[PDB]
Amino acid sequence: TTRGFVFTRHSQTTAIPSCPEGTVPLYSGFSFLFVQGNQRAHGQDLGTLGSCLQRFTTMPFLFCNVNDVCNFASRNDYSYWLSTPALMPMNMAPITGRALEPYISRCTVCEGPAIAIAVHSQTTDIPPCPHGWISLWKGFSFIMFTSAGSEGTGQALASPGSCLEEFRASPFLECHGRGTCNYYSNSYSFWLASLNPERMFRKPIPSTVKAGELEKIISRCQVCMGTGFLLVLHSQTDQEPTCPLGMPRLWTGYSLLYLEGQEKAHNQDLGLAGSCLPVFSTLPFAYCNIHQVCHYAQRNDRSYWLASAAPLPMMPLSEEAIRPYVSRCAVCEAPAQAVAVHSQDQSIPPCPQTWRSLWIGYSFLMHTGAGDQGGGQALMSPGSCLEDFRAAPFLECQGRQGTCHFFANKYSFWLTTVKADLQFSSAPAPDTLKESQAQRQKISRCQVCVAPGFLITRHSQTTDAPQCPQGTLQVYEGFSLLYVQGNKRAHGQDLGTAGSCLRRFSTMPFMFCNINNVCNFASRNDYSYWLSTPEPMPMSMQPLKGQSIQPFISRCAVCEAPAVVIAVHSQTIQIPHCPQGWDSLWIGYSFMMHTSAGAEGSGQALASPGSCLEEFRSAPFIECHGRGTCNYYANSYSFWLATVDVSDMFSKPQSETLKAGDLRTRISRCQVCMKRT
Amino acid sequence: TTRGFVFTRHSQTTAIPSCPEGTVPLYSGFSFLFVQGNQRAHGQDLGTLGSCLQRFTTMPFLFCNVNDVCNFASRNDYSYWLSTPALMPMNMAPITGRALEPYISRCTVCEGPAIAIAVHSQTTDIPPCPHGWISLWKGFSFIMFTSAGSEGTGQALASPGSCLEEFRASPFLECHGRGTCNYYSNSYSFWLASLNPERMFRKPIPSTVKAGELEKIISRCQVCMGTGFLLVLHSQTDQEPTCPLGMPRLWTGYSLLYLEGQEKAHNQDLGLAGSCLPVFSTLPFAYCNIHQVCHYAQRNDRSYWLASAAPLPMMPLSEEAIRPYVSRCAVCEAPAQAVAVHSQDQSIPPCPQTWRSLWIGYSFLMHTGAGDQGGGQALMSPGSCLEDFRAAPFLECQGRQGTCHFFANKYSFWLTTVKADLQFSSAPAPDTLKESQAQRQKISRCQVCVAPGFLITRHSQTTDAPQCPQGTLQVYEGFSLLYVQGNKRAHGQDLGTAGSCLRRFSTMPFMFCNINNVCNFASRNDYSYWLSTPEPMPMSMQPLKGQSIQPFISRCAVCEAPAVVIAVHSQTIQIPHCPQGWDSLWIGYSFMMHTSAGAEGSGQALASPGSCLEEFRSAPFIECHGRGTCNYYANSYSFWLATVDVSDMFSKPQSETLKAGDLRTRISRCQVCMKRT
Ligand SMILES: [Cl-]
Ligand SMILES: [Cl-]
Ligand SMILES: [Cl-]
Ligand SMILES: [Cl-]
Ligand SMILES: [Cl-]
Ligand SMILES: [Cl-]
Ligand SMILES: [Cl-]
Ligand SMILES: [Cl-]
Ligand SMILES: [Cl-]
Ligand SMILES: [Cl-]
Ligand SMILES: [Cl-]
Ligand SMILES: [Cl-]
What we know:
Two copies of one chain form a homodimer. Chain A is mostly beta strands. Chain A has one domain (about 5-675). In chain A, about 0% of the residues lie in helices and about 40% in strands. In chain A, strands 5, 6, 45, 46, 47, 48, 51, 52 and 53 form a nine-stranded antiparallel beta sheet that branches. In chain A, strands 9, 10, 11, 12, 15, 16, 17, 22 and 23 form a nine-stranded antiparallel beta sheet that branches. The first copy, chain A, is globular, with a radius of gyration of 24 Å. Chains A and B meet through loops of A and loops of B. The complex binds chloride ion (12 copies). Chains A, B: It comes from Homo sapiens. Chains A, B: This is Tumstatin.
C-alpha cells in the first residue's frame, strides 16, 4: 500500500513510538529539533525524517572554512532535542554522558500510502479530520521555540510536526558542543492559542496560566491521512477564493505570512496549508517557559498577514477596521502536486504539455518586516506565484494593541526579468521604478501547474550541467542558486527543489518594493549566493566581474521523477542503505547549512536531496553582489552533519581541528533514494 | 570646588539618593537603563546623566520616517528601568499606572571637582581606590543585561555605572509601549565574576548558586574620585606598556575588547580604562536570572581580547598556551585628556602646537567576531590609534572550553586614506591588498595628543560648516559621519565627538582585513551614513553618485572649549535650564537613535551634545554604499526622546500617529551647556 509518503512520529518519552495503523516503520531514532551554529539557528521540521536521527550527540555537526579547515565541537555552538518528562537534578546541574538518555525523546519514521497533514481547531476542542480523511493521532498545536540568544525555529502548521501528542511547557533541551544539556530560563515554547472566533478583529484578552491549567489556552490538533495533495490559494482580497473545478474545498481562512515571538520570525510558506488559518487574530499564539507558566498577550509579539488591495491607511487600523485589509485563502484537495514555473521574463512561462494550468502571476520571492526579520517563498511552491503584483503585499499586526498597519520599513522582494543574451557580460543595470505598470514590466512572471510526477534538482558543482539520475528525465538546466540576502535578511532555496536552479544567471536576480509604491533594482547593497566550482580565485584575489564570473558558478538540472525522492543520512563514514522498496539515485555528503555576510544564511532539509551534496567542499558557494561582483570571503562557512560512532553517542564531543586530507573522516554520508513503483 | 565633572548615583530603591560628600546635586529622577526600538537596543551609561530621567514613562521615545510621519507608542517597542526590591503580584500580573512608582529606582545627578571612576577587584573583596583617590561608594561589578529578543546593553567598566551599590539577580524591569512593566524569565543580568588570579590561563570551574549565596561568585568594586584623567595604553604584545613620563601608573592588565553573553556583544572602548582588566579569564563574567539563581561557566558565552603578534595558531590555544597571545595594558594618571587625531592620509597628522604628543599609529575603526556581533572605537578616543597595524588584531576565547583562537570569520576595519582632490568626483576605487606594507600605505594614520581643553562637535545639517558656539574656537571643519556598517554590523560615532566630523568625505571611508592577512577596500557590500541636508531627492528617486552627492551631506565643526560641555533634556516642549553655574551654547531636539539597512543602527548619549540636534528632521541622515551611491530608504528611521507631561507619567502611553506640522509637539527639547570658569 505504501507509496513513498514518509513522516515522523515523536513519543516525547523514552519509548520508541509505534507507527499509526496503515503505515509501516522505516527506522527509529532520537527527536532532533535544531542546531545553532555561528549564532544561526537551523531546524528540521518535526514531521519529516530529518527530525529523527539514529545517533544522539550534543554536537551533531561541524563547520568548515575557505582555508579548507574544519572545526568540530571547538567553538560555542548548540544542538536542541525534544525531551521526556524526566525530572532534572535539584541543584540545577546540567546532564552529561549516558545519563542524558532518559531525557531525550524517541521517534519513528513511517511510510504511508498517502500524505499526512495536521489540522488545528484554534480552540481547546479537538478538530475533526477533513471529510474522508483518517485520523493518525491527536495533540496540541506547536508552532515554534527559542532558546539561547532568542534563536530558534518552527514547524509548518500543516505538518504533523506542528501536532505534539503531549503538551509540555518545556518540550526541549538545550545542548552544547561542550557536552552538557539543560533547561534554561529563556527556553520558550510557542503554541497556537485557543481563540474566540467571534473576537477575530478585537483586542486580545491577556492571560497568564500556571501548572494545572496551562492547557486551557492551547489549541488542539489532529494528524490525518487522505488521498491527494493540498493546493493553497490566496485571494489577496477580502473575499474567499474558489477552488479549481474538480478539487474539493477543505477549508478557508486568512492568509498568514509569519509570526514573530521574542523578535524571531517563523514563516509559513504561502503554498502550504499552514499559511491558511481559519481564525484570524492579531495575536494567534501564546508562549510558555520552563517554570510551567504560559503567557498570552503579555509582552510585545506580533503577526504578519497577506493584505488586500484596500487603500493604504494613514494610521493603524483598530479592531473591526482591520477586516477589509486581510487576504483570504482556501485549501483544496488536488489529484497531484501543483508547482510554480517562473520565466525571469516578461513572457508568461507555459506549463509543460499535459500539465494542467491553474493560474498565472508574478514571482514573489521574500519580505522583511520589523527589525531584521522576514522570510520568503520557495520558487517551486505556488506561494511564490501571486496573481496580483503588490509593492505592499502584506501587513503587520501589533499583537496586544489589536491593530494592524503598513509601516514604512516593510519591503517586498520580487524575482526580476533577466535579458537572456546579456548574462554575465554586464553588471545589473540599476533602476528605480515609480509607476505600477513600469514595475510589472520588470518582474518575472509565473504560472502554477499540476505536475503528474515529482521534481528534483541535482547540482554538478562544476561549469557543466549534471545528468539527471537514473530513471528520471531532464526538464531544464540552470545555475545553482543557494540563497539571496535582501535588506540584510537571508532567504534560501532548498537545493533539492527547482527554486535552487535558475535558468538565467544574474548577480542581482530580484528587486525590492516599498509602501510608497517605489521599487528599486540593484540600487542598494544586496546579495545573491551560488554553489561554486573548483575554479581557483585569481592571484589578485579581487572580486570577479562580468564574463570572469562564469567559471565559478555551479550548474544544475531539474529532473522529473515517477515517484517520491528522499535523502537519508548515516551519521557515519558508511553510505546509508536506502529503505526497503526504494532505489538509489546518488550518494554524497550531509550538507546542513551555511552563513556568509553578517553571519546570515540558510540551510537544507535532511529529508531533501538538497542535503546530499555529491562532492564535499569546505567552500561550496560564492558570494555575489548587486553591483555585479562575486568573490569568496573569509567568513563564508559551510556546516555538515558529523559522523557519530557508537562511542560518540552521549559522551563528550572530542573537539578537533581538521585539515584538508582528514576532513571527510568526520562528515556524515547520505544517499538519495526514489520509491520503487 | 565643582568644575563640571558630572555623574549619576542610583539608589535602587524608592529613596532619592544623596550625592557623595564633596559633590553637589544638580537634579534627581528615575533610573533609566535602555530602550529597544525596531528590535534595536540603545542604552544610557548608568554613570552618566542620560541614565537619570526626571519623568518616568513606559514609552519615553517615538520614531519618525522618511514620509515625515512619526509614531508614538503604536508599534511593539520597549523601555527598561532599574528596579527596587518591591515584590511583584503573586499571580505574576504586570504592573501599570501609578502602581509602578514603588518599583522604579531613583537617581541623583551630581557635580564634582574631578572625575569619578570605578575600580573592580574581580574577587569577593572590595578593591582599594588608587593611591590618593577618595572613595565615593562601594558595590558590585555590573556589566550588561539582556531581555526581550536577547537585546540589551552594558556599562563601561571604569564608569561609576558599572558599580551598583546593591546586588540584584533581577535589577531591572521590562516595560512596553502598551503601558505594562514586568520581570520575565529571560531577563538576565551579567556581572564580573570573582576569579582566582592563579588560574587566569586555565579552564573555568563551573558553578550554579541560589538565593542566599549569589554574592559568593560576584566581583566587588569602589567608585573613587581623584584629580586628573585616565590614559589607557595597549601594548599589542605580551609585555606591559610603560606610562608616559610624568604620569603615574595606576594598574596594568589584559586588553579586553568585548564580552558576549547570550550572543550579544558588550564592548569596552580601548581608550577607556574599562578595557584594561587586571585578571584575565576566558570567561570573566557570570549571569543571573529573576529566579534568584546565578550561573558561571554553564552555557556558551565568550570573550574577546586584543592580541599580541605571536604567530597565528593552527588550532585553538589551550590554557597556558594562551598567555603569549593576549595583549597587555596600562592605565596611567594624566594631567589632561588625551585624544586621537586622524589624517585620512599616509602622512602622520601633527598634534596642534602646545599639545603634547604621546604616540603615533594606525586608525582602528571597528571589528566583527562570531555571528553578527562586534563593536568599534571612537575616533576621538586613543583606542582608535593602535601603534602597530594588524590584519588580525584580536582573538576570541571560547569561555568554558578554556581556549582562545583566531577563527576565519574575524574582521578588523581600519579608516583609509582619502585623496583630498578626488572627493565626490569619483566612486571609491576597489582594491585587494595582500602585502602588509601595501596595506599600511592605504590606512589612515593617527597621533594621540594631550589637549589642554575639551573638544565638542557641532553639525549644521546643511552644506555650510556651522560656527562654533560662543566662547569656543574652531579647530577644523568636516563632514557629518553618523555611523558605518561593515559585514552588516553597525558602529556609530557620538555626534558630540570629533569622530563624527571627518575632514575628507568618501562613501567608503574604511576597509576590512582578515586573518589571512588580506585586506579588501570597497569590495563587498558595506555602508557609510551621514547626517543630511534639506536637499530634496531627484524626481527619479535614483541613488546619487559622484558630485551629485555633495548637496546632501551635512557639514560639521570641531570646537575647542575651555571647560566641560554637556547636554540636558527637558522631556517637555520647554527648553531645559542649564544647571546653575553653566552657560548656554545651543538649544535643540532630543535625538536618541536611528536604524537603516537590516535595522542595524546606533545612537547618542543623552549626556553628549550629540543628542541635541538643532533642527528636528524626521529623516536626518542619508545612506551611502561602497559602490559609490547614496540615497534615502524607506526603512531609514530616527528615534527621539518624547515629551512627558505630569499627566503622561506612569499612565498608559497615548498612542498616536503624527503628521508633518504636528511632529515637534511630542519631541523633547534640549540645551547644550558649558561649565562657567
Ligand atoms: Cl562547539
Ligand atoms: Cl537561565
Ligand atoms: Cl504579546
Ligand atoms: Cl513608519
Ligand atoms: Cl543591490
Ligand atoms: Cl575576506
Ligand atoms: Cl510601542
Ligand atoms: Cl517569561
Ligand atoms: Cl558559559
Ligand atoms: Cl574558521
Ligand atoms: Cl563595499
Ligand atoms: Cl526604499
